[PDB]
Structure formats: structure tokens, C-alpha cells
Design an enzyme around this catalytic site. Structure first.
Site, PDB file in Angstrom:
ATOM      1  CB  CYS A  44      -0.956   0.017   1.191  1.00 34.11           C
ATOM      2  SG  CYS A  44      -1.902   1.572   1.299  1.00 34.11           S
ATOM      3  NE  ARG A  97       2.592   0.875   3.405  1.00 28.36           N
ATOM      4  CZ  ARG A  97       3.748   0.199   3.441  1.00 28.36           C
ATOM      5  NH1 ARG A  97       4.166  -0.352   4.575  1.00 28.36           N
ATOM      6  NH2 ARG A  97       4.489   0.039   2.340  1.00 28.36           N
ATOM      7  CD1 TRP A 110      -7.308   9.189  -1.601  1.00 31.34           C
ATOM      8  CD2 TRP A 110      -8.271   9.448   0.426  1.00 31.34           C
ATOM      9  NE1 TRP A 110      -6.378   9.759  -0.749  1.00 31.34           N
ATOM     10  CE2 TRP A 110      -6.946   9.940   0.487  1.00 31.34           C
ATOM     11  CE3 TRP A 110      -9.066   9.491   1.588  1.00 31.34           C
ATOM     12  CZ2 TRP A 110      -6.396  10.465   1.666  1.00 31.34           C
ATOM     13  CZ3 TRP A 110      -8.513  10.042   2.774  1.00 31.34           C
ATOM     14  CH2 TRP A 110      -7.201  10.522   2.793  1.00 31.34           C
ATOM     15  CD  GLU A 116      -5.839   2.324  -6.441  1.00 33.15           C
ATOM     16  OE1 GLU A 116      -6.191   1.238  -5.885  1.00 33.15           O
ATOM     17  OE2 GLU A 116      -6.012   3.476  -5.925  1.00 33.15           O
TER      18      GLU A 116
END
Ligand code: HEM
Ligand code: HEM
Ligand SMILES: Cc1cc(N)nc(CCc2cncc(CCc3cc(C)nc(N)c3)c2)c1
Ligand SMILES: Cc1cc(N)nc(CCc2cncc(CCc3cc(C)nc(N)c3)c2)c1
Ligand SMILES: C[C@H](O)[C@H](O)[C@H]1CNc2nc(N)[nH]c(=O)c2N1
Ligand SMILES: C[C@H](O)[C@H](O)[C@H]1CNc2nc(N)[nH]c(=O)c2N1
Ligand SMILES: [Zn+2]
Lengths: 405, 404
Positions: A109, A112, A281, A286
Site C-alpha cells: 500500500c 500509508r 480513496w 488504479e
């Protein structure tokens, strides 16, 4: 000199040592013989207790009460619970801590820097599929916040010995249907063919669009999953347009606002929470790169390049690169215009570099999966490309779990 | 035991069995992966077994495994190690070893070409001077008036009794970087240190952003010597854009020949400390890394401004737009000058074909995902979606410390 991985940033020539990796209690897929870092899926009482003791220590360290009588009493309480029932249960504040720490621990991720700001909904009283629906609906409303998105996780009861799991069958709370066509092609999202098929088998009346919001298939212990349709006013979507290319709006593309992972296992001190959906969000790449351009997804690259009048016959015209940039700009622009939180791959990676530095001070390192942190477009244009990374498994963790069917 | 390897675009699966042939540990452990690190942290018996293994590999390659020629060559090598502490390769073995080292190179996306490699034996070299003549012939050959040909030149191996033959430069052709009074660099910021050495060893330095460096060549235990490459041997390509007229006026240019000259070639236990090799560029090397990296020529912002883009916010994606135009300018300019180049789509497509060839031929291909995936448009190439196993096979190219 230091007996720990040296880590270098090749842009800035700066150096750190990762000491945090020493805290790892779990093996990844690599060995001295071969690196398996690019693989998407890496292949009793004694055991539970040591994991529990370790998480409780992490908890008491984090509130600076390590070694205290409150710490030793909690330890004794945890073992006495495991002694009579085979399991134990977290205190509310321990769950809040575990959930944040799982997010903080997630090597894949890039978002973070936000880890400390996570709304934890405690849903461990939930006892039916209907109640799961209610909880999930509350999550979405809270998280969506009419476009001003907020990170959240909802935690359902933990796995129990010889008693079925709470399971959300969908991989995300919001996903589009994929309808298998008579000619072998797919209408909608090809990623979602099976879950669409499963929903229909379980009694869903399907639509016939490229962007049909899937219903939830929710499983309460030892029951068949029950089907739930999300009320459309709850599911915020963004129609896609481009700032300067007037025709892009005519493509009728759209995406949902809320990225919400519903199929991961949240593990904390040995305890396993099989249903624990979380949301943030989006990063614009992506949607605009992966969701819309992957050849095995919506695959819209050629369509867009044809509209842009590019030479799609030859690779060296860089028609793919050009179309992908416009699609990404369109994703960013549309979310902005609609006032829905989004972050471009530049701001997100810059913010991840800041996070790296914070964790170096706070914990002496940060587990990170280079292949996943570097964005799918403009890689070396982002600071993370030039930054070396060490990847290891810390607990609490989110873990992939096999589809329940 | 044997890793399952999946392509996530096509849903296809293979197993890597080649990896069991690795004799050399990499940087990863079950506790942590270090695969993103660029550079992570001999007695008779040990050389003899690497030697035997390599000779075995060679006779297998010409399908004479077990012949009398194979037997006698094993005896020759043993006899030579047992008396001298070392041995020497026959030219044919050297040729096979060089090609195989390229084949085995996990960070190389060009490996579909592995079988087509011109090998110059320069082991009868005894002076910086002679090194220079060989390098010049290598360049002339490899360049071939824009029709590039892969080549390697192999200088005398390391010997226990003495210093190495070395090329100080990291590439045969590179641009000077002059650190300037006001803390900025003229030219290539990656070549400041090597530029300074060239000056300290008596080079008269230019002052442009694209001054081709001289070579510093070192024969064993001797100070390195300086040689200027004759301007006519260095093919350069002026950069223009197909549609944007003002791009030409950036004065950008780049050289045709990518030739690595600081790497060590290891064959059958033997080490060749000077063994420069070259092929042709993939456009993202020049367009993205060399011109766009912030610690390099770092031209992104200049180009974005020429394009009249909004530089004030990351969300206008000005960096992504400009980078693509810069890459396109590189491909167009090389095609216009009729110099061999390959774009990252063509290159990665051919790498995928290569993975399939190696699967059938060898049961695997060692590959370093982070290096194979292009620096722009990752997931738009097919390698992004391909799982890859990374490991060290020998013959190999290796990193070595700078000689100073
Ligand atoms: C606040 C905004 C956030 C952003 C921009 C963000 C960004 C991302 C991105 C880009 C990925 C990789 C996605 C992919 O390529 O499929 C990812 C993965 C992941 N994220 Fe974050 N995230 C955010 C919030 C969160 C939250 C709140 C959590 C959990 C509490 C989380 C946990 C994870 C985990 C566990 C993965 C790996 C999932 C997997 O392997 O499938 N993220 N995130
Ligand atoms: C024929 C055309 C070739 C192309 C298009 C090509 C492409 C590439 C690219 C894009 C890289 C990564 C470069 C970087 O990021 O710095 C690379 C690395 C590499 N290539 Fe190839 N290559 C070619 C020929 C060769 C040849 C002839 C050899 C040796 C005989 C070779 C051996 C290597 C090695 C050892 C690396 C790793 C370099 C390092 O670690 O610094 N390549 N290649
Ligand atoms: C909270 C959150 C925020 C955000 N911006 N993105 C995400 C990623 C969601 C997401 C979407 N599509 C695909 C995936 C990957 C799913 C996935 C699939 C497999 C096979 N293994 C895994 N470990 C993971 C994740 C999550
Ligand atoms: C034969 C060949 C063909 C081609 N197209 N490209 C190359 C790339 C040459 C190249 C240029 N600049 C930089 C590098 C990497 C240099 C380099 C630097 C450091 C510190 N560690 C490493 N392992 C490598 C390689 C080589
Ligand atoms: C094979 C490779 O590991 C796989 O395609 C990974 C690469 N990096 C990724 N990175 C992110 N963020 N998301 C992904 O789905 C992937 N896919
Ligand atoms: C830190 C990171 O591994 C490093 O920047 C690598 C990433 N991938 C690369 N890939 C190629 N082809 N060339 C490079 O120089 C790099 N740099
Ligand atoms: Zn690894």
C-alpha cells in the site's frame, strides 16, 4: 558496519538501515537461491499464545506502558482465556490499534502516510447477514461522505473453533458486473465474471450494461450467502470526461468513488477476522491505467487512441503511452470536477517518501513491495522508483484469503 | 521447491526448474526480500569444479557430451589447475561463454538476441595502447554506420600474481559532467567523478553539455592512460520531434552505441575484468532515464514549459505528457538517422517470446522484474503482468568496484 539491510535512494544518494525487519515472525517466498518477490500470491495453543503475547506487547509499547502491572495483568488475562476456551478476545482499543497497525504493516500500500487516520467500526456484535448489510451500508455512507472520502474499516466477529466464518463473497464492496457473451467476449468488467455468475445463480436479476453495480453476497456462520442490493443513492459514481478533448465524455465511461476491499483477512495477535472490509480513496492510476487499460480489463486503450487519431499500426508511435496519459488525466479531472477525493500518482508517491522517512525515525524501517509501490505509468518519474525497499511480513496484517466457493 | 510462475494477463502458468542450477546465493532470505537492491552486499578445488561445470556446459552445447574431445579437455583443465593454480579457455569456449553470460543476465530485456553476438578475443593484449586499438575496432564494428551489431571484446583474464586490466570509464561512450562554480553541473551529472579523473590525468576539457569523454585504460599495475576517441568513430544522433518544431532547438543529442565497460565477465571460474560489450538502445533508456531522471539531464520541466503545460500542479500530469513526447522524439530521431533502436513495446514483446523460448530450451529464465519492466508505461507492456524468478547462473556478468 550495521548487521541489517542497507537501503539506498539512488536519486539523492542517501542511505538507511532497516532494523525493523528483525521484528518479522513470518517467512516470505524468497531464499538465497532465488528471489520470488514479483509473485502476486506467495505460496494450536502454543502458537496462538506466543502471537497474542507479542501483539499485547506491541499494544503496551504503543501506549508506553511496557513492563507495567496493567501490561502483566493483560498478559495473564489473555493466557487464562486461551487456557479455558482455546481463544481470547481483544479490548476495543486493542482492536483500533491492531487495525491501524495492519494497514501500517501492508507492504503493497502506497497510501500509508494516512495510517494513523482510520475510523474503526467495531462490528463484533453482528449476528446475521442482514445485520452485516446494515453495517456495510453504514460504512459506505460514512466513508463516502458525499465525496469527501474518509478511511474506514468495519470488523465483524472473529473466526471461531468449529463454527463458520463471517464472509463477504465480493472482493470489493463496489465492483461492476461482467456478463459472459454468446461470442466469448465480456460485457462489463472481465475481472468479475465469476462473482457476477454467482450472484445470478443466487437469484440476482442482472442488468446488461458495462457499469452495472454488483450486489453483495454476504455469508453469516454456517449459512448460505444471502444477496443484498445496494441502494443506488449510496454508491457514488463519477462520469468521466477530459479537460480539453470534448469527445471523451461521449465514451460514457464512469467509475465508482469508493475503493473498498472486502475479501482480505485481518489477523491480530493470532485472532483471524475473515470479514473486515476497509476503504480509502483512489490513486488515479488504479482507475485510469489498470481498470480501464489492462488488456484483460476494460481494455479501452485502442478505442481512445483511435479517437485521438493515433497510428495504432506501429508500437513506435507510442499511441498506447499517449492514450493512457489522456485517460489518466481524464480520471483526475473528472474526480476533481465532481469533488470526490482522488490523488494522482505524483502526489501519492511523494507522500509515500515522507511516510518512509517518518517510519525510519519511528520504527527503524518500513516493509514495502517495490513492484506494487511504483505506479503502472511513469514509474521513474516518481521518487519511489529510485528508492530501494525491503519487503517482509509484520503482524498485525491483512492477508489474502481463498474465495469461499 | 520449484516455483510456479504465472502470467496474470493470460492466466498461463509455468514452473521454473532452471533455478536449481544456481550455485550462487543472491541477497534475499525467507525473513526479507532485497530484490529491489541495485548492488547488494580461488582455491584449486573450487575453481576446478566451476571449470568442469563450464566445460560440461560447452560440450553439451555442441552435443559432444561424453566424447573423447570432452574427456581430454577435462583432463587438460585439471592438469593446468593442478600445476598452475589456473587455466585458459580455448577461443570457441570463450565465444560460448560470452553468449551464455548475456543469456543468463537477469536485468537484460534484450536477451532474444543472445545467440547473435560478435566476440573479439583480445586476450593477447599487453598494453593500454593495444587496449585502445581493440576498443576502436570494437566501436567501428558495432556501430556499422547506424546498423548496430551486438559485440563483446574480451581482455586478458585476472591473474593471482598481478593487478587487473581495467577500463575506468563505465561506458565506452559517455558525456562529460563539469561541476560548476555555482554548485550546478554542465553535462551529465552521473559522470562528474570520471570527468574529474580524466582532467587530473591531463585531458583538456570542453565546456558543452555533450562533450564525449576520453578513455582511461589500465594495464596491470600501471597508472591508467588517456585516449581520445576519434570523433568520426562516435556516431551521434541529434534529437528532433516529428511535430514540435521548437524541440530541435533544445540542442539535445545522444550517441548510438550503448557499451558497458566496467563489468566483469566470469566464465568457468575465470574472471575477465575488462570485457566491454554493446548492442543497441531501447528508447526509454535515453528518453526517460538519461534525459528525464532528476539527477541526470533532468529536462522534463524545460520540455513541459515549451509545450505550454501547467507546471504548477502534479495533477495536470505535465511530467507524463512531456516524458512521452521526449521518448517519441528519441524514436523518431533514431529512425530518421537510420540508427538501430527499439521501443519498449517492441522490446518487451520480444522478451516475452524469449521467456517462452527459454522455458522449452532450459526450463526457466532468470529475470529481474524491476529492471525488465520499462521506466514509463509499465503495465502497458506485457512483462508487467508476468511473474519472474530471479537468480544467478554462471557464466555471468558481475558488478565490480571502480578501480580508484
Ligand atoms: C487513504 C487512501 C489510500 C490509498 C491512496 C491507497 C492506495 C493503495 C494502492 C494504489 C494499492 C495497490 C492497489 C492495486 O494496485 O490493486 C493499495 C493496496 C493495499 N492497500 Fe492501500 N490505499 C489507501 C487506503 C488504504 C486503507 C484504509 C487500507 C486498510 C486499512 C489500505 C490497505 C491496503 C492493503 C492491505 C493493500 C494490498 C491489497 C492487496 O494485496 O490486494 N489502503 N493501496
Ligand atoms: C541487442 C540489443 C540490447 C538491448 C536492446 C538491451 C537492453 C537492455 C536494457 C534496457 C537494459 C537495462 C539498462 C539500464 O536500465 O541501465 C540492459 C541491461 C543489461 N544488458 Fe542488455 N541489451 C542489449 C544487448 C546486450 C548485450 C550484447 C549484452 C552483453 C553481451 C547485454 C547485457 C546486459 C547486462 C549484463 C545488463 C545489466 C547491466 C547492469 O547491471 O548495469 N545486453 N539491457
Ligand atoms: C483501501 C484501498 C484503497 C485504494 N486506493 N486501492 C485499494 C486496492 C483495491 C484493489 C482493487 N483491485 C485489485 C486489488 C488486488 C486484489 C488482489 C488480488 C490477488 C490475486 N492478490 C492480492 N493480494 C490482491 C486491490 C484499496
Ligand atoms: C549492452 C547494453 C544495451 C543497452 N540497450 N543498454 C545498456 C545499458 C547500459 C547502461 C547505461 N547506464 C547505466 C547502466 C547501469 C549502470 C549501473 C550502475 C550501478 C551503480 N550499478 C549497476 N548494476 C549498473 C547501464 C547496455
Ligand atoms: C507480476 C506482477 O507482480 C504483478 O503484475 C503486479 C505488479 N505490480 C502491481 N502493482 C500494483 N499496485 N497492483 C498490481 O496489481 C500489480 N501487479
Ligand atoms: C531502486 C531501484 O531498484 C532502481 O532504481 C532500479 C529500478 N529499475 C531499473 N530498471 C532499469 N532497467 N534500470 C535501472 O537503472 C533501474 N533502477
Ligand atoms: Zn526477493
Amino acid at each position: 558496519g550495521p548487521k541489517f539491510p542497507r537501503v539506498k535512494n539512488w536519486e539523492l544518494g542517501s542511505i538507511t538501515y532497516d532494523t525493523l525487519c528483525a521484528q518479522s515472525q513470518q517467512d516470505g517466498p524468497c531464499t538465497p537461491r532465488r528471489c520470488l518477490g514479483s509473485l502476486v500470491l506467495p505460496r494450536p495453543a502454543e502458537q496462538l499464545l506466543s502471537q497474542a503475547r507479542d501483539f499485547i506487547n506491541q499494544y503496551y509499547s504503543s501506549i508506553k506502558r511496557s513492563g507495567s502491572q496493567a501490561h502483566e495483568e493483560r498478559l495473564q488475562e489473555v493466557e487464562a482465556e486461551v487456557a479455558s476456551t482455546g481463544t481470547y478476545h481483544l479490548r476495543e482499543s486493542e482492536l483500533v490499534f491492531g487495525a491501524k497497525q495492519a494497514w501500517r504493516n501492508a507492504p503493497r500500500c502506497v497510501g500509508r502516510i494516512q495510517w494513523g487516520k482510520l475510523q474503526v467500526f467495531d462490528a463484533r456484535d453482528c449476528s446475521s447477514a442482514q445485520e452485516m448489510f446494515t453495517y456495510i451500508c453504514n460504512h459506505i455512507k460514512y466513508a463516502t461522505n458525499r465525496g469527501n472520502l474518509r478511511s474506514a474499516i468495519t470488523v465483524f466477529p472473529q473466526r471461531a473453533p468449529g463454527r463458520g466464518d463471517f464472509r463477504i463473497w465480493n472482493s470489493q464492496l463496489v465492483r461492476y458486473a461482467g456478463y459472459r457473451q454468446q461470442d466469448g467476449s465480456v460485457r462489463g468488467d472481465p475481472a468479475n465474471v465469476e462473482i457476477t455468475e454467482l450472484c445470478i445463480q443466487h437469484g440476482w436479476t442482472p442488468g446488461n450494461g458495462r457499469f452495472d453495480v454488483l450486489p453483495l453476497l454476504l455469508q453469516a456462520p454456517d449459512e448460505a450467502p444471502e444477496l443484498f442490493v445496494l441502494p443506488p443513492e449510496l454508491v457514488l459514481e463519477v462520469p468521466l470526461e477530459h479537460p480539453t478533448l470534448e469527445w471523451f465524455a461521449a465514451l460514457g465511461l464512469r467509475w465508482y468513488a469508493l475503493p473498498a476491499v472486502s475479501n482480505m483477512l485481518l489477523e491480530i495477535g493470532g485472532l483471524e477476522f475473515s470479514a473486515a472490509p476497509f476503504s480509502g480513496w483512489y490513486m488515479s492510476t488504479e482507475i485510469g491505467t489498470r481498470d480501464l487499460c489492462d488488456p484483460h480489463r476494460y481494455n479501452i486503450l485502442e478505442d481512445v487512441a483511435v479517437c485521438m487519431d493515433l497510428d495504432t499500426r506501429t508500437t513506435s508511435s507510442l499511441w498506447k503511452d499517449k492514450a493512457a496519459v489522456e485517460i489518466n488525466l481524464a480520471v483526475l479531472h473528472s474526480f476533481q470536477l465532481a469533488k470526490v477525493t482522488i490523488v494522482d500518482h505524483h502526489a501519492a508517491t511523494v507522500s509515500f517518501m515522507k511516510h518512509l522517512d517518518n517510519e525510519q525515525k519511528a520504527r527503524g524501517g518500513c516493509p514495502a513491495d517495490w513492484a506494487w509501490i511504483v505506479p503502472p505509468i511513469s514509474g521513474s518519474l516518481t521518487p519511489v522508483f529510485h528508492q530501494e525497499m525491503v519487503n517482509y511480513i509484520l503482524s498485525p496484517a491483512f492477508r489474502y484469503q481463498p474465495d469461499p466457493w
